[PDB]
């Protein structure tokens, strides 16, 4: 009868809470009034479209302003000594010298420097003028409108799909593997061959003439002939200059390895062959599940067949087909887990093997990106583990999964939790113990007494990969190894050359300071997983509260009685888990930032010597590289690092409000409000105004979220200001 339209219960709430929950309840379909599986799936589908339309519009927006407000064309001509423009600024709040200050580049007013690496992205892909950016902006905007269209389209009763269709998993897998993965990477490879490669060779190929231009001299003869080697006949020379004819070859598909020496990025020929190769594996593999032809696998049959003899895995995977196909949260958990891993995967491979020409020369961009994807990966992981327990509560069928791997999982969960506890306490005690030991020796002027363990195991791996520093002589280090002799005339010359250039990021040199920090990160991993896993497995029931599953995923507590039950819900478990996310990726991003900062600065001996103790982090990382940042203004004058320092403090202030909502809880605030609501009602003149919605204190769960949110935002923004301002 009032908004929340989707909840009678919340709509009848007389207070301001109705509002808050209404905002908070909006996307939870299963909890709305008179909901069905059909409406659930259909709303989810439409929502996916909605997301896509926002994404395409967002991307088009970037291209739009780079083309309209940027210096894209000044960059292409001189990428090394021009700062890429993101956007113009029109701020009526700025003072006279502010407008002078922010006018960087070739700009006719105040501008901001892009640290997204979209320049080098574009530029490496083939984008040459503002025109190209405009056309792409129009296109993707058109795709946005199309997606919006499509959302409302399959909302009508004629175009409403049936639940059976949504449950056709085999078909979606076949199509996504073959088409979405296979075809689209094949088509990209098409783009690299037809546009990117020629663009790097200095021949501008556009919509109007591609069809008329030969990418290879004897094109499409090798292809059908099976003389594929001709496509790798003459690669670009070692003196090739990117985007110019000088030193350019004709090959379209190679396995060279290493980098394009002047740009220091992967070879677009290697990238072409890569996308093409995977494309084939995807296309062949995408014909694996049974649909409407009779040929193909059964998922159910595969899963149910995989039960080992002598019941060492119980009933194996029997019943998982149904509990997965039914459970949406399960699918989102698997998806988020995989997506989180690959997000960090991307982050860790991109920095050490950059793919873009004249990236990695851009320090700030690289730092910004690598922080970006690791934090995104962290949040995504916590979320994976957050729809973990939502499954465990709402979705699991105890009878239908009897004695399976899943039920057996629940069975020995105390073992799992307790052994994670062991693994985290071990690390926590020893690593901290060895650091603080290292500090005390530093303090007393005896650094020779430090406990510095050399990372022999990683140093071994680097040796097996062909770095020769450590002199183990294994695999790709040793010249008398089959592994060496096999591919020595393939790509190893490009590889080995790149691994041993220590001015690049590829498999950096490692010492005892590396050793400690990785075990700090391991502490990060294991503990966060302890919170999340514990929260997932005890979502259903515990000894304190056996009937927890009757309440659901978020609840304040179960009262003060029998000891006290604050932060008992799996919700709260995930909440607690976010703090470790934050702390852990905080450590990882620092690790990253410094070990590069000292590389770029030209003194890696700063890192190796101060990373072995924590004051070293405090003094040589934090205290040193904020010098310029905090100076952005002083009583004497100003410079260009105004916004970062403003935002630095902004983040800190957000960070401390969070503490407010986290530490102080409801009873104080409500009674505060209780006196205020009397105060209003017997204040004359003001008497004549009264509220419609009774003023009430935010909930516990509300307080829980609002703290967390402020904390995270402050975290991110503060670092971002630091990272960028210092690296720049």
């Amino acid at each position: 009868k009032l908004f929340p339209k989707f909840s009678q219960g919340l709509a009848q709430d007389p207070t301001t809470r109705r509002i808050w929950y209404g905002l908070a309840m909006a996307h939870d379909f299963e909890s709305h009034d008179g909901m069905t599986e059909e409406n659930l799936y259909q709303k989810i589908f439409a929502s996916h479209f909605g997301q896509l339309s926002i994404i395409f519009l967002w991307t088009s927006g970037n291209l739009f302003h780079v083309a309209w407000q940027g210096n894209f064309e000044q960059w292409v001509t001189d990428p090394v000594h021009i700062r890429p423009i993101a956007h113009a600024i029109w701020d009526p709040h700025f003072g006279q010298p502010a407008v002078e200050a922010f006018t960087r580049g070739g700009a006719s007013g105040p501008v901001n420097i892009s640290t997204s690496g979209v320049y080098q992205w574009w530029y490496t892909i083939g984008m040459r003028t503002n025109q190209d950016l405009y056309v792409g902006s129009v296109f993707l905007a058109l795709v946005s409108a199309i997606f919006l269209f499509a959302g409302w389209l399959h909302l009508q009763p004629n175009f409403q799909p049936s639940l059976s269709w949504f449950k056709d998993a085999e078909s979606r897998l076949n199509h996504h593997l073959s088409g979405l993965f296979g075809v689209s990477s094949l088509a990209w490879t098409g783009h690299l061959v037809h546009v990117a490669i020629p663009e790097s060779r200095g021949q501008h190929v556009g919509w109007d003439n591609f069809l008329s231009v030969l990418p290879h001299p004897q094109g499409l003869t090798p292809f059908f002939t099976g003389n594929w080697a001709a496509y790798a006949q003459s690669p670009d020379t070692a003196s090739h200059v990117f985007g110019t004819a000088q030193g350019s070859g004709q090959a379209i598909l190679t396995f060279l390895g290493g980098f394009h020496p002047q740009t220091q990025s992967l070879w677009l020929t290697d990238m072409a062959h890569h996308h093409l190769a995977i494309a084939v594996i995807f296309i062949v593999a995408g014909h694996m599940y049974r649909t409407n032809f009779g040929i193909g696998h059964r998922m159910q049959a595969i899963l149910e067949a995989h039960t080992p003899p002598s019941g060492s895995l119980g009933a194996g995977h029997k019943g998982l087909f149904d509990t997965v196909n039914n459970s949406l949260h399960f699918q989102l958990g698997l998806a988020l887990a995989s997506v989180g891993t690959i997000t960090s995967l991307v982050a860790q491979h991109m920095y050490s093997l950059p793919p873009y020409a004249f990236q990695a020369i851009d320090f700030t961009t690289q730092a910004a990106l690598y922080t970006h994807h690791q934090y995104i990966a962290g949040f995504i992981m916590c979320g994976a583990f957050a729809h973990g327990a939502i499954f465990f509560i709402r979705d699991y069928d105890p009878e239908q999964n009897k004695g399976n791997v899943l039920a057996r999982m629940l069975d020995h969960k105390e073992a799992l939790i307790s052994h994670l506890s062991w693994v985290s306490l071990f690390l926590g005690f020893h690593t901290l113990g060895l650091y603080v030991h290292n500090d005390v020796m530093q303090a007393f002027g005896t650094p020779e007494k430090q406990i510095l363990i050399e990372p022999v195991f990683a140093q071994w791996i680097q040796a097996a990969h062909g770095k020769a520093l450590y002199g183990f002589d294994f695999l790709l280090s040793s010249k008398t190894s089959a592994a060496f002799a096999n591919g020595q005339s393939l790509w190893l010359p490009g590889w080995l050359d790149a691994i041993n250039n220590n001015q690049n990021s590829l498999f950096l040199t490692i010492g005892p300071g590396d050793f400690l920090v990785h075990h700090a990160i391991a502490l990060g991993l294991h503990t966060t997983t302890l919170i999340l896993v514990k929260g997932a497995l005890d979502a259903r029931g515990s000894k304190l509260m056996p009937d927890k599953k009757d309440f659901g995923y978020s609840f304040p507590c179960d009262g003060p009685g029998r000891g006290g039950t604050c932060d008992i819900s799996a919700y709260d478990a995930f909440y607690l888990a976010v703090f470790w996310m934050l702390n852990t990726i905080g450590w990882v991003t620092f690790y990253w930032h410094w070990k590069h900062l000292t590389l770029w600065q030209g003194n890696v001996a700063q890192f190796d010597e101060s990373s072995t103790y924590l004051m070293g982090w405090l003094r040589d990382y934090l205290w040193l590289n904020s010098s310029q940042l905090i100076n952005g203004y002083n009583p004497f004058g100003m410079n260009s690092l105004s916004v970062w320092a403003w935002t630095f403090l902004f983040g800190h202030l957000i960070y401390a409000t969070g503490f407010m909502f986290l530490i102080s809880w409801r009873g104080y605030w409500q009674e505060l409000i209780e006196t205020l609501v009397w105060a209003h009602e017997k204040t004359p003149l003001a008497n004549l105004v009264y509220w419609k919605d009774k003023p009430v204190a935010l909930s516990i769960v509300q307080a829980r979220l609002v703290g967390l949110a402020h904390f995270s935002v402050g975290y991110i923004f503060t670092y971002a200001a630091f990272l960028i301002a210092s690296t720049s």
């Binding site: 700025f94 003072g95 502010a98 200050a101 969960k413 073992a415 939790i417 307790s418 506890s421 500090d439 005390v440 303090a443 007393f444 002027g445 514990k534 515990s542 000894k543 304190l544 609840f555 304040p556 507590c557 179960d558 009262g559 003060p560 009685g561 000891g563 006290g564 039950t565 604050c566 932060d567 008992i568 709260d572 607690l576 703090f579 004051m615 405090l618 205290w623 010098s627 905090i630 100076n631 952005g632 203004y633 002083n634 009583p635 403003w646 403090l649 530490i663 102080s664 809880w665 409801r666 009873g667 104080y668 009674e671 006196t675 205020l676 009397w678 204190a697 909930s699 516990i700 703290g707």
Partner: protein, 319 residues
């Protein structure tokens, strides 16, 4: 008791007032300074907010030995009168100038004190009963809550008021001593040369302490120098305690941010592990009470904070 509502509501008002018109001034300064508008700032140069009363009272204090206290030869203190007295080339005492920056910090104080009073007085006046919990008196002085009912009743007790009162007190007192230390090194202390004075921090206060960035940089960042490099010296213990106090401060946050529901289940799993190996204790392992969680929290928070400021000042001022 019969009009507590008016008292607490008015204290609430006056505190929001004070908060806006003190913090708000610093945020305003930071924004104007960031936007390139120094002529619009709250400062002796641009904006003037002179402590006219204080200056009057200082005026009356130095002239007093002549008029209102004839038998008194010099002033009670040189921070009112003139006559800069110095010993061993160091400044013992000298007239303290009062400007806009001092106007600022005092009103911050007065804000902080008023907030602390808000929390504690509210605590004492409604200890027995309120609109939410009329029978609070029966429940005790020290107790966590009365459940998730009534929308949720977290931290209703008088203890919880003392709890939160400790944080604001720490806040207030911390700005006072920072005020003190910066004030003293910039406008008072230093060496005495050819008929002239070189202060320790060169009178940056009046111009720097008007913005948050000035504290961040000219006080915190610049001064922490001697503590952060105290290694290899006599003062290294202060660096160790510097780090240790951060540790313990941060360590408090685990207790403050969490609740014993998690911890008790954790303990269930660990207890399993013990029982599996016949090493379970007779004294059944239990998570701390909610109240104890709060007490441990506030205790470690204070100890960490205070000990960090302690290692800071002493290494700073000794070196």
């Amino acid at each position: 008791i019969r009009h507590r509502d008016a008292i607490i509501s008015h204290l609430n008002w006056v505190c929001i007032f004070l908060g806006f018109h003190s913090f708000g001034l610093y945020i305003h300064n930071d924004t104007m300074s960031a936007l390139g508008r120094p002529q619009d700032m709250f400062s002796d140069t641009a904006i003037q907010l002179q402590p006219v009363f204080a200056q009057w009272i200082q005026n009356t204090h130095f002239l007093a030995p002549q008029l209102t206290a004839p038998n008194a030869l010099a002033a009670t203190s040189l921070t009112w009168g003139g006559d800069l007295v110095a010993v061993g080339g160091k400044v013992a005492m000298m007239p303290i100038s009062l400007g806009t920056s001092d106007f600022m910090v005092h009103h911050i104080h007065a804000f902080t004190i008023h907030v602390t009073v808000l929390i504690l007085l509210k605590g004492v006046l409604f200890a027995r009963s309120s609109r939410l919990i009329p029978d609070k008196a029966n429940l005790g002085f020290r107790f966590p809550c009365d459940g998730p009912g009534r929308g949720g009743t977290c931290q209703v007790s008088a203890w919880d008021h003392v709890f939160l009162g400790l944080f604001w007190m720490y806040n207030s007192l911390s700005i006072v001593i920072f005020h003190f230390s910066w004030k003293m090194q910039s406008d008072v202390w230093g060496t005495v040369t050819a008929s002239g004075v070189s202060h320790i921090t060169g009178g940056n206060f009046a111009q720097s302490a008007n913005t948050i960035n000035g504290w961040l940089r000219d006080f915190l960042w610049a001064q922490s120098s001697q503590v952060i490099q105290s290694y290899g010296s006599a003062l290294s213990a202060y660096g160790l305690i510097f780090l240790g106090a951060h540790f313990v401060w941060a360590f408090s946050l685990m207790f403050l941010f969490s609740g014993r529901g998690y911890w008790q289940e954790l303990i269930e799993s660990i207890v399993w592990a013990h029982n599996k190996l016949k090493v379970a204790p007779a004294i059944q392992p239990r998570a701390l009470s909610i109240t104890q969680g709060r007490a441990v929290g506030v205790a470690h928070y204070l100890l960490g904070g205070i000990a960090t400021t302690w290692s800071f000042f002493l290494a700073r001022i000794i070196s």
